[PDB]
Ligand binder design. Structure first.
Ligand SMILES: O=C(O)c1c(F)ccc2c1O[B-](O)(O)[C@@H]1C[C@H]21
Ligand SMILES: *[B@@]1([O])OC2=C([C]=[C]C(F)=C2C([O])=O)[C]2[C][C]21
Length: 270
């Protein structure tokens, strides 16, 4: 009833990109939605790291002092793309610092260390099940989870399930109020998303996001909570893939899809 009240040229955009774009956007005030390939599976890539940090925060509600726990790690933990954890190899970092690094710099070593804390990919999957997400699945660790093989459901979710879970965690009751705001604050401080959803969001609106980039099969993504001034927040997810292993991803296509989603919701932007 409230889905796709205004059609947008997502098909033309994905054809120009040479792949598939999946979009789900939710106006949390009216419940209106924009939906395009929203129930197809796309590889999570690093976008799982936001939900990873939420799962850690959930655990911290029952474990006072979890976030402050210092974690030492060896050089064998430092897999490629670990920009924060490599600078603290000789000192260690706290669980909260590892969570912030995973969210804000997509730190791979931090993500693997936190996955171990939660009981591995099945433990993160169990957390997502506990909030009502039956679509999300994490199956592997960094870096193997980025393979993005066409048709492979491992390490995927759907744009719709990503948006629904993000809403529950950032705006709903899935986390206690202090942990909810900490999750929002980590997302707001993300440094890797300036050319994706944020490029579609006016500078005077608050926004938090988590990006993902698999490095193959034109596969990259971003999800965000957006607070336009004077109205209810918007939650949205934009995922891409492409048929060939050497197909490149496009940040511009993600930003353009985000623009179309906001336009489809009637949210006046840039
Ligand atoms: O490795 C990084 O990407 C990185 C980081 F994650 C946090 C801070 C810095 C980094 O590198 B740089 O831009 O050369 C600079 C000292 C600053
Ligand atoms: B992950 O998918 O996140 C990521 C990587 C490399 C470059 C990026 F821009 C991103 C991202 O989008 O956050 C590697 C670590 C993984």
């Amino acid at each position: 009833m409230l889905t796709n009240l205004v059609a947008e040229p997502f098909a033309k955009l994905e054809q120009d990109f040479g792949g598939s774009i999946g979009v789900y956007a939710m106006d949390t005030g009216s419940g209106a939605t924009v939906s395009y390939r929203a129930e197809e599976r796309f590889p999570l890539c690093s976008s799982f790291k936001g939900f990873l940090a939420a799962a850690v925060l959930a655990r911290s509600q029952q474990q006072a002092g979890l976030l402050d726990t210092p974690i030492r790690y060896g050089k064998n933990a430092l897999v490629p793309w670990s920009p924060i954890s490599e600078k603290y190899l000789t000192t260690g970092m706290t669980v909260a610092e590892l969570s912030a690094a995973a969210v804000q710099y997509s730190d791979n070593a931090a993500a693997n260390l936190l996955l171990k804390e939660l009981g591995g990919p099945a433990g993160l999957t169990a957390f997502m099940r506990s909030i009502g997400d039956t679509t999300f699945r994490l199956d592997r660790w960094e870096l193997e989870l980025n393979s993005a093989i066409p048709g492979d459901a491992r390490d995927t979710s759907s744009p719709r399930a990503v948006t629904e879970s993000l809403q529950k965690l950032t705006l709903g009751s899935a986390l206690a109020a202090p942990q909810r705001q900490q999750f929002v604050d980590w997302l707001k401080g993300n440094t890797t998303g300036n050319h994706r959803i944020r490029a579609a969001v006016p500078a005077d609106w608050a926004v938090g996001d988590k990006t993902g980039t698999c490095g193959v099969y034109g596969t990259a993504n971003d999800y965000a909570v957006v607070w336009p001034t004077g109205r209810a927040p918007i939650v949205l997810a934009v995922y891409t893939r492409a048929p060939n292993k050497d197909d490149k991803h496009s940040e511009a296509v993600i930003a353009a899809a985000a623009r179309l989603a906001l336009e489809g919701l009637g949210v006046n932007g840039q």
